[PDB]
Amino acid sequence: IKKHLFLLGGHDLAMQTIVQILTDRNVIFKDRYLQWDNALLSQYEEEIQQYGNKEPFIIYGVELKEDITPPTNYIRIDHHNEYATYPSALEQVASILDHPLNRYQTLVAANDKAYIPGMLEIGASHEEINLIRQEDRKAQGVIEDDEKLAQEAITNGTEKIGSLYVVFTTANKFSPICDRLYPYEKLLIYTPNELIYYGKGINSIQKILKRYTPISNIFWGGGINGFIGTVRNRLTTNEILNIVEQIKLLEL
Ligand SMILES: Nc1ncnc2c1ncn2[C@@H]1O[C@H](COP(=O)(O)O[C@H]2[C@@H](O)[C@H](n3cnc4c(N)ncnc43)O[C@@H]2CSCC[C@H](N)C(=O)O)[C@@H](O)[C@H]1O
Numbered sequence: 001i002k003k004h005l006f007l008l009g010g011h012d013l014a015m016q017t018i019v020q021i022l023t024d025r026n027v028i029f030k031d032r033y034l035q036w037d038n039a040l041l042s043q044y045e046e047e048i049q050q051y052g053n054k055e056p057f058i059i060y061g062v063e064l065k066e067d068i069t070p071p072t073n074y075i076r077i078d079h080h081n082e083y084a085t086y087p088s089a090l091e092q093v094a095s096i097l098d099h100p101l102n103r104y105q106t107l108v109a110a111n112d113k114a115y116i117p118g119m120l121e122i123g124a125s126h127e128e129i130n131l132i133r134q135e136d137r138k139a140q141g142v143i144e145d146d147e148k149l150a151q152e153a154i155t156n157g158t159e160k161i162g163s164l165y166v167v168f169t170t171a172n173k174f175s176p177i178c179d180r181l182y183p184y185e186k187l188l189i190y191t192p193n194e195l196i197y198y199g200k201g202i203n204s205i206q207k208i209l210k211r212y213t214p215i216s217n218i219f220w221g222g223g224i225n226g227f228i229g230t231v232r233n234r235l236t237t238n239e240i241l242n243i244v245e246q247i248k249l250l251e252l
């Protein structure tokens with residue numbers, strides 16, 4: 001009896017796979033082609049006014065920052081921060097729709113939730129891993145210039161302190177750097193106004209970050225050894241450099 005409405009956040013391979021399942025199942029959904037840094041619920045302010053607090057409908061927000069107050073019939077579909085232990089939004093959406101995921105889609109969910117380690121743990125071949133990563137990067141909107149700066153940062157802006165790789169870059173997208181350096185146990189990528197940490201012990205990284213910025217500028221996911229980063233242009237360069245030093249001190 002309850003009718004469903006899905007509002008989609010930033011685009012990646014999992015979000016692209018969500019579009020296909022929502023399309024195949026005749027579901028009402030809205031997709032404004034958002035990126036990771038503009039997935040605001042206010043992007044769908046018109047839809048919230050139309051369907052918000054209307055009785056038959058349930059509104060599912062898929063990885064959307066709640067910059068406006070959601071209505072009473074709104075359900076958050078997310079797997080970050082305080083829900084970093086939840087399955088990927090792709091898995092949650094398929095469960096809502098009673099949709100069984102095929103082999104390809106299970107790989108998309110595993111890579112979305114837990115990268116290459118996630119795909120390896122459901123027995124992905126080297127070819128499947130390469131296919132998923134290529135389509136994930138393409139869905140994130142990485143282009144040739146992102147790959148260019150990735151190779152540059154690994155050759156000229158990288159040092160290894162213990163088990164921790166530290167990469168300075170002026171690149172926009174960081175997934176090319178992760179894929180070139182995998183495998184790794186710890187990876188720290190920073191720009192003059194942004195940093196993201198990948199690998200073991202994100203909670204100790206979270207304790208560092210909370211000494212420099214409010215929690216609204218911090219996001220994390222992917223599990224115990226997933227990722228945690230800062231929102232771009234929210235921290236000054238000296239704040240980023242201090243965090244970089246504190247993260248290197250954990251290697252001592
Ligand atoms: N342990 C890991 N190591 C490496 N990659 C991983 C790991 N775990 C997951 N991944 C991969 O990373 C991707 C995770 O996707 P998501 O779950 O959608 O998570 C995304 C975003 O949804 C999330 N996020 C939340 N708020 C913001 C914001 N304000 N700005 C930017 N990003 C924000 O943070 C993640 C992006 S982090 C990298 C951002 C960087 N500027 C870039 O463009 O490359 C996915 O493709 C996985 O395959």
Ligand SMILES: [Mn+2]
Pocket residue numbers: 010012014015063
């Ligand atoms: Mn996502």
